[PDB]
Design a protein around this ligand. Structure first.
Ligand SMILES: O=[N+]([O-])c1ccc(O[C@@H]2O[C@H](CO)[C@@H](O)[C@H](O)[C@H]2O)cc1
Ligand SMILES: CCCCCCCC/C=C/CCCCCCCC(=O)O
Ligand SMILES: CCCCCCCCCCCCCCCC(=O)O
Ligand SMILES: CCCCCCCCCCCCCCCC(=O)O
Ligand SMILES: *[C@H]1O[C@H](CO)[C@@H](O)[C@H](O)[C@H]1O
Ligand SMILES: [Mg+2]
Ligand SMILES: [Mg+2]
Length: 466
């Protein structure tokens, strides 16, 4: 199984998950600083990202890890609150700029291509206090931050992700309220946030296109989470339609407007409008894009950035009583096949990624695809000789080769989540996704390879597997 010459082999981190230095060098608070400091068991053992992997202090150690893997690409994110403590360019933290410039320069001198994310679940607290993604004001704040990032780093950075996993963010932060600001708004908050996230992405893309592209010649996208979905009963038409409709709801809701025509999928619009009307709302809970907005949003992605971990089965579930929520709007229930293995919510279903990549090829006119996340967690404490986990990786890579060679999918980058064991949001340090083990009890935060790191380096070196 030889991959295309020039295939990108990457690993990923995110600012709040690895950096620490949460209040170092003038850095402003982000929503996770506030959230984790409030405790109340919203996070495993009230843990925080105050220190995390200490990557703000120990970049050199991450670089060693990157070099040892032989990565061709490295995905990391910029901390908005580190660069602009209040969210705005009224005050620019030069130490923040110097830090990210050092990363970029170090990567490039070692032949590693940076894949840089502007924003990864970590809004400056000030901007959340002004309504976060539920308010229209954030669109301009994000655009200006994007312009600042392009101007500062765009002479060396050519692959950009504007917003990490916008679909999950809208649900977790604003619908379920599992993430900060932590207020549930079942069936309203997610859609209101999604509408603004899509517009802010589009605004930032046009800023890049109109102001930076001619000079810088890079490309810009946003990353999206995708769970592959199959009908629970394969002979049930209602289950067959429900599985397709649930893909449309979680993935195409964002991808269609941005990649196709600047509007939501029709089934999303009709389901939500119809439910909202019977529920007694004067408007659909899904905010409409104006005609000017559709025109702005259409064609605002230079490649398809997707994130895959798992698959689920889907059964139709009629919302007879008009219950409020996204699952109820979609009229679906999800669950795994009892025969599947799992580690946490990650049920190991490798053929899920092949099916997904085929779906993207067929639905989004054969785009360039970067898989910016894929991986497997281990429970803490985790064995260094992680042979079982590595087996799940190998199986996944066989499916990637299959998608490329059989389905002719234009997959160009595979990126493992994560380079490092890190702060796994509400799970804290109890869920270990890293190719490198990190000791969170030792003040030096030493990195040590898992077997997966060694085996993944072999894959990269051979540009494939047997
Ligand atoms: O909140 N409510 O009062 C309320 C809401 C919905 C309702 O009917 C349901 O409407 C859905 C969308 O139109 C149909 O897909 C479904 O088949 C039907 O059972 C009845 C009452
Ligand atoms: C803990 C389980 C998480 C594992 C990921 C699987 C998620 C399954 C969701 C199916 C997509 C259905 C489309 C509607 C989105 C609803 C999102 C939500 O509010 O929960
Ligand atoms: C509001 C519009 C968004 C449409 C719904 C998108 C749903 C995205 C899928 C949610 C999966 C959550 C992943 C986290 C899994 C976990 O670790 O618990
Ligand atoms: C949550 C109660 C608010 C007090 C009621 C005044 C606001 C009425 C207008 C909103 C109508 C939609 C209510 C949701 C109905 C439902 O989910 O079934
Ligand atoms: C992608 O998924 C990983 C694992 O859940 C998470 O830690 C990242 O922050 C997210 O972008
Ligand atoms: Mg709403
Ligand atoms: Mg990404």
């Amino acid at each position: 199984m030889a991959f295309p010459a020039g295939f990108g082999w990457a690993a990923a981190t995110a600012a709040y998950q690895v950096e620490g230095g949460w209040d170092a060098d003038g850095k402003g608070p982000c929503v996770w600083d506030t959230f984790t400091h409030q405790g109340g068991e919203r996070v495993f053992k009230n843990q925080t990202g105050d220190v995390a992997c200490g990557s703000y202090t120990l970049w050199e150690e991450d670089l060693k890890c990157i070099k040892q893997l032989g990565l061709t690409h490295y995905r990391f994110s910029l901390s908005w609150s580190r660069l602009l403590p209040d969210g705005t360019t009224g005050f620019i933290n030069q130490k923040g700029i110097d830090y990210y410039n050092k990363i970029i320069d170090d990567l490039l001198k070692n032949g590693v291509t940076p894949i840089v994310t502007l924003y990864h679940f970590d809004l400056p607290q000030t901007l959340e206090d002004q309504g976060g993604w539920l308010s229209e004001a954030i669109i301009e704040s994000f655009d200006k931050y994007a312009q600042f990032c392009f101007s500062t780093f765009g002479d060396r950075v050519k692959q950009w992700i504007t917003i990490n996993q916008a679909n999950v963010l809208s649900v977790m932060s604003y619908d379920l309220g599992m993430f900060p600001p932590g207020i549930p708004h079942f069936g309203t908050g997610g859609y209101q946030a999604a509408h603004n996230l899509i517009k802010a992405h589009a605004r930032s893309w046009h800023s890049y296109d109109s102001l930076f592209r001619k000079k810088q010649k890079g490309m810009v996208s946003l990353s999206l989470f995708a769970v592959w979905l199959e009908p629970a009963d394969p002979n049930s038409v209602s289950d067959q339609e429900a599985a397709k409709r649930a893909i449309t709801f979680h993935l195409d809701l964002f991808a269609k407007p941005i990649f196709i025509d600047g509007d939501y999928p029709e089934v999303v619009k009709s389901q939500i409008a119809s439910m909202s009307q019977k529920q007694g709302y004067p408007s659909s809970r899904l905010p409409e894009f104006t005609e000017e907005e559709k025109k702005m949003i259409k064609g605002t992605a230079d490649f398809f950035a997707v994130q895959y971990y798992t698959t689920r089965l889907i059964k139709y579930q009629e919302n007879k009583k008009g219950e409020l929520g996204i699952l109820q709007d979609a009229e679906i229930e999800f669950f795994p096949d009892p025969s599947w293995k799992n580690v946490d919510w990650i049920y190991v279903v490798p053929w899920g990624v092949c099916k997904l990549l085929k779906y993207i090829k067929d639905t989004y006119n054969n785009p360039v695809i970067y898989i910016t996340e894929n991986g497997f967690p281990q429970s803490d404490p985790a064995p260094l000789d992680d042979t079982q986990r590595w087996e799940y990786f190998r199986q996944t890579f066989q499916e990637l080769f299959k998608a490329i060679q059989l389905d002719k999918v234009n997959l160009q980058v595979y990126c493992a989540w994560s380079l490092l064991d890190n702060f796994e949001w509400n799970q804290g340090y109890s869920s270990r996704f890293g190719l490198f083990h990190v000791d969170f009890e030792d003040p030096a935060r030493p990195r040590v390879p898992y077997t997966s790191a060694k085996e993944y380096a072999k894959i990269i070196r051979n540009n494939g597997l047997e």
